[PDB]
Design a protein around this nucleic acid. Structure first.
Ligand SMILES: [Mg+2]
Ligand SMILES: [Mg+2]
Ligand SMILES: [Mg+2]
Ligand SMILES: [Mg+2]
Ligand SMILES: [Mg+2]
Lengths: 438, 133, 53, 64, 98
RNA sequence: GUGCUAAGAGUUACUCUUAUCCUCAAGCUUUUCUGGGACGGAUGCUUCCUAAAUAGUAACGGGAGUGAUCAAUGGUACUGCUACUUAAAUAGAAAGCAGUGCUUGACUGUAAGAACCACAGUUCGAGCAGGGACGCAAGUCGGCAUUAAUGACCCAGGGUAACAU
RNA sequence: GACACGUGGCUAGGGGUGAAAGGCCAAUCAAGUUCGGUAAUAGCUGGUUUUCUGCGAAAUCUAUUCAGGUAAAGAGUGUGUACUAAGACCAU
């Protein structure tokens, strides 16, 4: 304890940092618990950084940006991303597959696109052999490499052919939850055509691995949501079929993995199983996932309340569905700016780590109007026009909801984020809601 | 010398555990809820909450009781005792991260020596090396 | 002071391993050999401690 | 030299184990010698702490 | 690059101190910034309390010494004529040189 | 070092070795505050007035203390009575006055956070682990209602532990 | 005459000589002069040499063989980082 107001040294951090071993900069990076703390660490050692430190810094920037709920397009994140991009340009042929996968995933998940010749160098360096880089690297490195190269553009379809030819013999030795990231990375580029063939072959063998029992009950939660979405989206096109063994296994494991999903992940999984049964929402599964949907609606972003409102669109007369839908109505009322905040004040927003961007999500929730929520207010408008008799008991609530939907639509159309088809559908949904509101 | 003896955190000031509320000679102010009292009658907070100074009937006359009232957003996130301890722990951890962000790595927070682990007992964290049988 | 005959003296453990406590004592007002049960960290059990110089 | 070291370690471990086995009798002896509430300084009996100091100092001189 | 030191007031006279005070004095504290700046400029870069012996490493031992003789070192040095210019304000001329 | 002296030794008066009174010749020390200097006085710590209603605030400015006591005057659980407890201030239906029953927490390893503060240090400290004490429990106990009785480091000595010879 | 003078000689520096004065020993002697160590040392005194532009203190406090010295804190400058603030005022 230095000077009575300066934090006393923590126990485990001092025990980890005091080593005879090397690795001090990477340990300082890994104990940085916020963003300009990491930037001050990168400032202190900027004449001392090596490729391992650049990979660790990119991964830690990714984790700290997701750890708060602030946007990746913030200036702090983009400055750290460009500073790491300088060292990536310096060491562009020295980076091994661990470090190249680290910098690619870290700079794609903060949505900072590298120059495409640098991405070309960084992928050709991964395949400048007889595929020997992809046979000495573990499954997580291949997953991070595929996720990073699915971003940064780079739908080269010749690089992906040799990557999929290198990873196909090794794929059944992979841990069973890195497979959905591989299939998602193949789908995210312009691979898997007819909406070349080793890519579809490794996607088919990955979905054959994911479809089986005794592993689908052994995936981690929130990996089964993406696996169920990928199966429901790509089953009849290439791989497994309608069969009730898979749907029974998905429902059984979904009933067990309910509490371990964050509220932004539940409606994706339930729409995934709804799409699975169309290749619906069966009995006594909605009655145990819907208390979770009501308890997760207090902290739930606007595209997630879209997915939950579309989920609760085809039935509204049930009282549990009705008050769940009015809870989503109050949530959409809360996080969408008034046409005329008062929850917390903007002067006291934390610059710290844990959920500081969530406090910035309140305290004038305007300014979170990116393009995703710009189309998503139209989607929520359609989903609430579908669910008439659940919210229609509350007249002033649905009137103020229509007012805020129209105000956000006008504002984001003024910002250039909508077009005339979305504006017309938004107008139809807001006039339905406003006619129901009086 | 100087012997500064006064009240440090006034009423309505947000407090965190360990913060000295007032330093006095003799119990001019008496401890209340979520409040500890030291050897020299120092009043220190044992909970996250705003300080409240209220006057109550006393054995000699007009006792002033210093207390810490927990936040209304706490006791809503919180059997109850375990839940309050978990809520307080997260607030204390968040305070440290915010303070470290505000002091931008310009103060010597942790040892980070080139030495073998700073002497560790079975419990660990001893700045005292002790030989082991 | 020189008028005050109270001195510091040592309390050696019965158990073994020579762990000790140093506490002061008046010789005149206590001509006992001072014996108390104190915690011994070597054995982690309470044992007795007699007075030796 | 290490055989002599392990012999010394075993010898000290043996003596501490034997004294730890003897130890409950030692605390009982000390507690009994401090305890005085029986057979007071005289048959007068007439004040408990006054009679529990003169005999205790006399026992301390006897058990010096 | 922080210069650390052990706290003083713990070597002796521990009977006259409270349990919390003794627990507090076992900890180490960093040097004050002004003193640390002077030591850093003077060139102080000591990574260990004492230098590790090159011997005692397996395979690196004395040809004829069974180990070596340690030589415990003392720490007094202050004279206004010859030793430690850091510990004197000015230089004293010598005493008549016989 | 120098002159005599003492005790051994050699050639066997003289010479050598060692020691030390009293002489000779040297070498070193021989603070500071101060309505000049000298003289006298003082140089840690605590409290009250100055000090002007947060804190803080000077003068060889003005009045009291202190360099401890106590194996109980410590801890815990109780029993009677009521204007004292002390250096002063703040306080105290017990933190007062008389008692009892057990005990040693007058511990081991730590401690977030603060008061303070040039630095060194100083002060409070909930909580965790160990083993205990008292109490049916509630819960208190890391010395005493608090603020004084607390001299760094070096050096020397003791117990124990590891390594070494 | 315990005299004066002349010509060579002797006593030299921690030493000489002195009817004894801190006297004399080549016009600065309670330690000669010259040379060397020596570019001794001086917290003291004096001095520090062309121009323009921008910013701009302090004489408080703590410690000190220390109070005309030094070091730390306060107050300055440049550089960096970062807030519509770890800021200044005013209102309730
Ligand atoms: Mg003293
Ligand atoms: Mg020793
Ligand atoms: Mg000479
Ligand atoms: Mg001024
Ligand atoms: Mg001065």
């Amino acid at each position: 304890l230095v000077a009575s107001g300066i934090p006393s040294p923590r126990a485990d951090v001092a025990l980890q940092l005091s080593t005879p071993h090397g690795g001090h900069i990477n340990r300082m990076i890994n104990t940085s618990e916020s963003i300009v703390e990491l930037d001050s660490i990168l400032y202190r050692f900027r004449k001392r950084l090596r490729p391992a430190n650049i990979g660790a810094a990119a991964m830690r920037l990714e984790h700290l940006n997701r750890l708060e709920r602030r946007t990746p397009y913030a200036l702090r994140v983009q400055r750290v991303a460009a500073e790491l991009q300088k060292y990536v340009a310096t060491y562009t042929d020295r980076l091994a597959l661990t470090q190249a996968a680290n910098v690619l995933r870290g700079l794609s998940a903060v949505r900072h696109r590298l120059p495409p010749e640098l991405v070309l160098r960084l992928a050709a360096g991964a395949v400048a052999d007889g595929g020997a880089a992809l046979r000495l690297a573990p499954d997580v490195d291949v997953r991070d490499l595929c996720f990073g190269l699915a971003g940064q553009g780079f739908n080269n379809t010749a690089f992906w052919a040799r990557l999929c030819a290198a990873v196909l013999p090794r794929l059944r030795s992979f841990d069973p939850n890195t497979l959905p990231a591989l299939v998602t990375a193949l789908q995210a580029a312009q691979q898997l055509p007819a909406p070349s063939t080793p890519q579809a072959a490794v996607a088919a063998e990955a979905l054959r691995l994911l479809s089986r029992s005794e592993t689908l009950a052994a995936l981690a939660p929130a990996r089964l949501a993406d696996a169920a979405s990928l199966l429901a989206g790509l089953g009849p096109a290439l791989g497994v079929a309608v069969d009730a063994r898979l749907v029974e296994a998905v429902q059984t494991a979904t009933a067990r993995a309910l509490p371990s999903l964050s509220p932004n992940q539940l409606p994706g999984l339930l729409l995934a199983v709804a799409a699975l049964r169309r290749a619906q929402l069966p009995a006594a599964l909605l009655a145990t996932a819907l208390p979770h949907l009501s308890a997760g609606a207090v902290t739930m972003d606007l595209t997630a309340v879209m997915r939950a409102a579309r989920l609760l669109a085809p039935h509204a007369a049930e009282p549990a569905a009705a008050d769940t839908l009015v809870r989503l109505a109050r949530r959409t009322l809360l996080l969408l700016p008034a046409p005329g905040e008062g929850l917390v004040t903007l002067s006291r927003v934390p610059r710290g780590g844990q959920a500081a961007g969530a406090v910035l999500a309140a305290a004038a929730p305007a300014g979170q109007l990116q393009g995703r929520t710009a189309g998503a207010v139209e989607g929520v408008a359609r989903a609430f026009a579908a669910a008439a008799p659940a919210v229609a008991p509350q007249p002033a609530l649905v009137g103020e909801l229509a007012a805020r939907l129209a105000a956000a639509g006008e504002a984001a159309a003024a910002r250039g984020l909508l077009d005339e088809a979305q504006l017309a559908s938004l107008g139809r949904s807001v006039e339905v809601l406003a006619a129901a509101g009086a | 010398x100087x012997x500064x003896x006064x009240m440090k955190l006034t009423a309505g000031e947000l407090a965190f555990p360990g913060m000295i509320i007032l330093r006095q000679r003799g119990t001019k102010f008496h401890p209340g809820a979520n409040v500890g009292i030291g050897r020299d009658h120092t009043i220190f907070a044992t909970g996250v909450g705003k300080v409240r100074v209220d006057t109550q009937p006393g054995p000699r006359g007009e006792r002033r009781v210093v207390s810490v009232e927990p936040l209304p957003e706490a006791l809503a996130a919180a059997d109850s005792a375990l839940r309050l301890r978990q809520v307080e722990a997260e607030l204390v951890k968040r305070r440290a991260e915010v303070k470290r962000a505000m002091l931008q790595g310009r103060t010597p927070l942790e040892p980070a020596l080139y030495f073998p682990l700073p002497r560790t007992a079975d419990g660990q964290l001893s700045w005292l090396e002790r030989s082991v049988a | 002071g020189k008028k005050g005959v109270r001195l510091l003296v040592k309390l050696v453990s019965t158990a073994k391993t020579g762990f000790f406590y140093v506490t002061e004592k008046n010789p005149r007002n206590t001509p006992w050999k001072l014996k108390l049960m104190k915690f011994d960290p070597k054995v982690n059990k309470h044992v007795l401690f007699e007075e030796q110089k | 030299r290490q055989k002599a070291k392990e012999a010394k370690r075993a010898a000290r471990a043996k003596q501490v184990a034997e004294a730890m086995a003897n130890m409950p009798k030692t605390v009982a002896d000390y507690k009994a010698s401090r305890r005085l509430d029986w057979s007071e300084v005289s048959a007068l009996d007439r004040x408990x702490x006054x009679x529990x100091x003169x005999x205790x100092x006399x026992x301390x001189x006897x058990x010096x | 690059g922080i210069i650390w030191h052990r706290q003083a007031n713990y070597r002796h006279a521990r009977h006259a101190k409270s349990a919390s005070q003794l627990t507090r004095l076992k900890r180490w504290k960093p040097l004050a910034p002004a003193f640390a700046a002077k030591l850093r400029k003077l060139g102080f870069s000591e990574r260990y309390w004492a230098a590790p012996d090159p011997q005692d490493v397996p395979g690196f031992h004395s040809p004829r010494g069974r180990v070596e003789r340690p030589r415990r070192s003392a720490v007094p040095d202050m004279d206004h004529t010859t030793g430690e210019p850091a510990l004197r304000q000015s230089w004293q001329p010598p005493n008549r040189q016989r």
